[PDB]
Amino acid sequence: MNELVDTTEMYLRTIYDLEEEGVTPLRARIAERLDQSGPTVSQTVSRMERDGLLRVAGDRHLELTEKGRALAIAVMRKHRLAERLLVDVIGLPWEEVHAEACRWEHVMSEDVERRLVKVLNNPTTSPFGNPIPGLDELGVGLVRLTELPAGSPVAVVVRQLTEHVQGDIDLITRLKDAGVVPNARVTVETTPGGGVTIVIPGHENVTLPHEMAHAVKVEKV
Amino acid sequence: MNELVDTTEMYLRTIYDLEEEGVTPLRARIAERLDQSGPTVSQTVSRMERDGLLRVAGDRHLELTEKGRALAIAVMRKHRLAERLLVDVIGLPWEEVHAEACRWEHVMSEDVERRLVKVLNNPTTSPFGNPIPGLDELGVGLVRLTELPAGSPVAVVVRQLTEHVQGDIDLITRLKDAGVVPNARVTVETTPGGGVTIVIPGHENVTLPHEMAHAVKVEKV
Amino acid sequence: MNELVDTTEMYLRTIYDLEEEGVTPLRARIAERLDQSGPTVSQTVSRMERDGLLRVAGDRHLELTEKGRALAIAVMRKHRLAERLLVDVIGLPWEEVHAEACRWEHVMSEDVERRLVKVLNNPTTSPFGNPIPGLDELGVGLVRLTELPAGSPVAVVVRQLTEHVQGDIDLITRLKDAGVVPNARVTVETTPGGGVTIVIPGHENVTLPHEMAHAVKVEKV
Amino acid sequence: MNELVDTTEMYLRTIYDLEEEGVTPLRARIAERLDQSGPTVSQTVSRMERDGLLRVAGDRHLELTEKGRALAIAVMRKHRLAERLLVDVIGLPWEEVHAEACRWEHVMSEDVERRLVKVLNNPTTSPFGNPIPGLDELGVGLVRLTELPAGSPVAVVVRQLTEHVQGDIDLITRLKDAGVVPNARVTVETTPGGGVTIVIPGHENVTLPHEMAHAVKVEKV
DNA sequence: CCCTGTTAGCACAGGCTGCCCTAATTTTAGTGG
DNA sequence: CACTAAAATTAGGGCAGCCTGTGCTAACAGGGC
Ligand SMILES: [Co+2]
Ligand SMILES: [Co+2]
Ligand SMILES: [Co+2]
Ligand SMILES: [Co+2]
Ligand SMILES: [Co+2]
Ligand SMILES: [Co+2]
Ligand SMILES: [Co+2]
Ligand SMILES: [Co+2]
Ligand SMILES: [Co+2]
Ligand SMILES: [Co+2]
Ligand SMILES: [Co+2]
Ligand SMILES: [Co+2]
Ligand code: NA
Ligand code: NA
Ligand code: NA
Ligand code: NA
Numbered sequence A, B, C, D: 001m002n003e004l005v006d007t008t009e010m011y012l013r014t015i016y017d018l019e020e021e022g023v024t025p026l027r028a029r030i031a032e033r034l035d036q037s038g039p040t041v042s043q044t045v046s047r048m049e050r051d052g053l054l055r056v057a058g059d060r061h062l063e064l065t066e067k068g069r070a071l072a073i074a075v076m077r078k079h080r081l082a083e084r085l086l087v088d089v090i091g092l093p094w095e096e097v098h099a100e101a102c103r104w105e106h107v108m109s110e111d112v113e114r115r116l117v118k119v120l121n122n123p124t125t126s127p128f129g130n131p132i133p134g135l136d137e138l139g140v141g142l143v144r145l146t147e148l149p150a151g152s153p154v155a156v157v158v159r160q161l162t163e164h165v166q167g168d169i170d171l172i173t174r175l176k177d178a179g180v181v182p183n184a185r186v187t188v189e190t191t192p193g194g195g196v197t198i199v200i201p202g203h204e205n206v207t208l209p210h211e212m213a214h215a216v217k218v219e220k221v
Numbered sequence E: 001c002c003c004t005g006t007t008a009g010c011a012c013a014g015g016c017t018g019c020c021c022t023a024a025t026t027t028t029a030g031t032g033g
Numbered sequence F: 001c002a003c004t005a006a007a008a009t010t011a012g013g014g015c016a017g018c019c020t021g022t023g024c025t026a027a028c029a030g031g032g033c
Helices: A007-021 A027-034 A038-050 A066-090 A094-104 A110-119 A163-167 A169-177 B007-021 B027-034 B038-050 B066-090 B094-104 B110-119 B163-167 B169-177 B210-214 C007-021 C027-034 C038-050 C066-090 C094-104 C110-119 C163-167 C169-177 D007-021 D027-033 D038-050 D066-090 D094-104 D110-119 D163-167 D169-177 D210-214
Strands: A054-056 A062-064 A154-161 A185-190 A196-199 A206-208 A216-220 B054-056 B062-064 B154-161 B185-190 B196-199 B206-208 B216-220 C054-056 C062-064 C154-161 C185-190 C196-199 C206-208 C216-220 D054-056 D062-064 D154-161 D185-190 D196-199 D206-208 D216-220
Touching: A007 A027, A007 A038, A007 A062, A007 A066, A007 A163, A027 A038, A038 A054, A062 A066, A066 A094, A066 A110, A066 B110, A094 A163, A094 A169, A094 B110, A110 B066, A110 B094, A163 A169, A169 A206, B007 B027, B007 B038, B007 B062, B007 B066, B007 B163, B027 B038, B038 B054, B062 B066, B066 B094, B066 B110, B094 B163, B094 B169, B163 B169, B163 B210, B169 B206, B210 B216, C007 C027, C007 C038, C007 C062, C007 C066, C007 C163, C027 C038, C038 C054, C062 C066, C066 C094, C066 C110, C066 D066, C066 D110, C094 C163, C094 C169, C094 D110, C110 D066, C110 D094, C163 C169, C169 C206, D007 D027, D007 D038, D007 D062, D007 D066, D007 D163, D027 D038, D038 D054, D062 D066, D066 D094, D066 D110, D094 D163, D094 D169, D163 D169, D163 D210, D169 D206, D210 D216
Parallel strands: none
Antiparallel strands: A054 A062, A154 A185, A154 A216, A185 A196, A196 A206, B054 B062, B154 B185, B154 B216, B185 B196, B196 B206, C054 C062, C154 C185, C154 C216, C185 C196, C196 C206, D054 D062, D154 D185, D154 D216, D185 D196, D196 D206
16 A cells, blocks of 8 residues: 555654654655655655645755644644554553554544544543644643753653654663653663663663654653 | 555455445446546556456456455455444444544554454454454354345345445435344335335335345345 | 547538538447447547537437537638648649548648648639638638439539548549549439439449438539 | 647657757656656557567667667658648748648658659758658658867858757747758857857857757858 | 447556655765865 | 765656546347338
């Protein structure tokens, strides 16, 4: 059928994910993350620009238009409501719902959404801690590991694991094994290479590269 | 993204659907049902034949190969397990689950399938009475209105409403309103034009064309 | 490329030719003259009716609409101006120009038409005697052998040989050999089978079937 | 009927035209010139290759087969004999004959060709200077502006204006106004962008892009 | 029968858009010699 | 200022999926002689 299921939507959500991670939305990013060639992401963006879903600014960063953002949210909303349903009701293992939802997010009707809201008791986040956007236009409804000073370790409590980390399954798995998940006290220390090392009381240590770090939100506590 | 989500799968399932209805699997049929041009379905079938999913026989009827059938079933299975999940758990309205499932059927993993089996207590049919196929290769596990003699009406109990009828949403709705659903005593009489008229005690009458009739199974009772 | 070069135009021009011959414009006719199956001419007529070029009446005879006739004339005009150019200037043999122009009639620009008018000195007929139509909307500008009483022969002077006769090349050739051409005194007598026999002083006799006869205009003289 | 009148022939002639201009015959070229999509030209070339009219070489350039070239010439021959007839006899204005012939080239019989030879006194070129090919198979019968060294202007005499230039009507018009036509002394100098500037004694200057330049043959004199 | 159409299924030529790829180049911004 | 890593562009294609125009055959339907 199609790897991504829906190219445009996956481009939009990748744009969004990058913003959520606090990194500059460049075309080069999309290529890395969706594993497509440079020429491809460029030609694809065009079609998208030509359809008023986004604009390539002066510095070349991607800017979502009024329309483009509305949709991007829409997809992200379904995505997370799905991960909820998969973990809570369906009972699918944690380190597997993201990849499943990354597909469902492109077919869930807006109706099934609403009904899922009522069946999960007006949830507000995903099994990974990220908030469910666009909940009201549907009809209802803290730092980043990179923003942590180096030097001496720090005690914090894991609050969010944005989609990007959810991507590397090998890692999202290790993190579960070492308990690094929402509402989990743990200490982190800035590595030499802009990275971050997580010290979990009881389990082996786990180090995240600068990029992966941009995708973990914690609370200084 | 794509109307059908996945063309090939929908062509396979339509082949299957026709068999289930007991009508000969011609390319002309697929074109009607998927609303595509003759040339389109032809060219698409070829690609399919070229990948050994089906063969066009001498009389030109479509025959699913060993491989093709296995996949066709896999789809039909996800389809029905989903309609189950949509009606029972999610709580989505009856005359709406089919259209929703027609899309989910192309993205549900085999894993989510199995778990849905346990969550629904090893169901064996869909909210419309059709059996869930390939349940064992997964890892677990009466007449047709056309075959009804003409003349005087006959009391029967609606047992199945195959996917074809679920298709015409306007009709599947009327049928719900008139109560014509699984385990429902009603009488049927053969119309002049090979059609069939259903007399529901209490609600307006409802007449089905010969084609739609091929898609309703009942039990002489 | 295409036998007819342009299906639609040839259908229009055949309708026109039929009128010119005084026979009823039925779809059956077009099928015979363009050598195409019944189903083909029908479906093609629909496309034409759907584009308002003609209408199928109550008796089923074909009626050219305002638009359809304007175009029809336009083609006939090019066809005849071309036959002129082919015989007078190019110098292509008589019994061959018709077939050539039947193709040129579908590519001659309206401009080349006007200039051909000046190069041939405002002609008004074809090498076969038929009048060049629509000459003013461009920008410038007697009985039928069937309508002849039977019994005793009649002296007449050949005035026109409509396209239909130009069609049968074997016949249009014999007619040339027997001198039966425009401005030629000859006698004709009605045969038993609604046909007609032409008596040419000097050459063998030549008999035309009722149909071919509908395509020859003469002057009682 | 059809924009090109005859796809295959136009493709063949475009291959020829490209060779005549000294540029590599790529599918991408055809697409540009006949204004059709990439996929279209590709699929069409296949039908052509499948019928042994051409072959796509290793470097992907198009090679006309024995048969393919014969036909190609045939079309080019008609095309030019026609431009001759249009200008000399019909009297159609210069910057208009090419477009007309581009259509007549697909319907002129081999007989009408021969006869046009005799009517134009065995011509050997077109009103633009290009030689009339395949004249013997019928039955009868210097540098390129890009190959000109840069630096100081050069006096040359325009000898040919290949079809490609005849295409851009706006340009072929200007060239007439500035007298740049066969047997015309004029000077040309290489522009920075691989282009070429023609200096006509008396009329405004005229600059041709690198591509157009590939389409003009002259004689160093 | 003969003369006219209709109904149902397909074929092949011609055209198109959305997505994706590789081989080169080019364009951006910094970076030390 | 040459040099570069990083990010894009330029060039020429590939395959999946959709369309309309034109043509044909087998079979069947109706009216009138
Ligand atoms: Co996720
Ligand atoms: Co996705
Ligand atoms: Co950073
Ligand atoms: Co269903
Ligand atoms: Co489906
Ligand atoms: Co039946
Ligand atoms: Co004629
Ligand atoms: Co014609
Ligand atoms: Co008559
Ligand atoms: Co020309
Ligand atoms: Co042409
Ligand atoms: Co060049
Ligand atoms: Na890829
Ligand atoms: Na369609
Ligand atoms: Na035919
Ligand atoms: Na085009």
